[PDB]
């Protein structure tokens, strides 16, 4: 039941994204631009394939996956990872693994907003997205 996550979403709040990016070794200049960028995230399904686009003035990504099936991914910061996305407690949980490290990207719906929690190391970033009509 991924249905309430589908659609077009725009970033409206960000907490601790610089901490998260620093933890991943992202360079200062990229952090700097990223801290002023407001992406649009588009989540689409076709049968049990989901496609998740992240669009911005800086970087752009797109992944397609089946829930519960591992896929290769190259992240916006150029990490080559092994990924899996699953529903867990009604949350869309994306786990990335590379070099023995793990990142998680957890999405949930609260009061119609999509809350993305990004964790690497001890860093925890919370980004809030709201629907675009
Ligand atoms: C879409 C522009 C983001 C720019 C950040 C690039 C360097 C850090 C990337 C970290 C992993 C992906 C973070 C996604 C954040 C989000 O979807 O809001």
Curated annotation (Swiss-Prot):
Domain of life according to the entry: Eukaryota
Ligand binding (octadecanoate): 127-129
Modification N-acetylvaline occurs at: 2
Modification Phosphotyrosine, positions: 20
Predominant localisation class: cytoplasm
InterPro entries: Calycin, Fatty_acid-bd, ILBP, Lipocln_cytosolic_FA-bd_dom
GO BP, one annotated term: response to xenobiotic stimulus
Subcellular location: Cytoplasm
Gene Ontology molecular-function annotations: cytoskeletal protein binding; icosatetraenoic acid binding; long-chain fatty acid binding; long-chain fatty acid transmembrane transporter activity; oleic acid binding
GO cellular component: a single term: extracellular exosome
Modified residues (Phosphoserine): 23, 83
Positions where Phosphothreonine occurs in the chain: 8, 30
Residues where (9Z)-octadecenoate binds: 127-129
Family designation: Belongs to the calycin superfamily. Fatty-acid binding protein (FABP) family.
Domain comment in the entry: Forms a beta-barrel structure that accommodates the hydrophobic ligand in its interior.
Name of the molecule in the record: Fatty acid-binding protein, heart
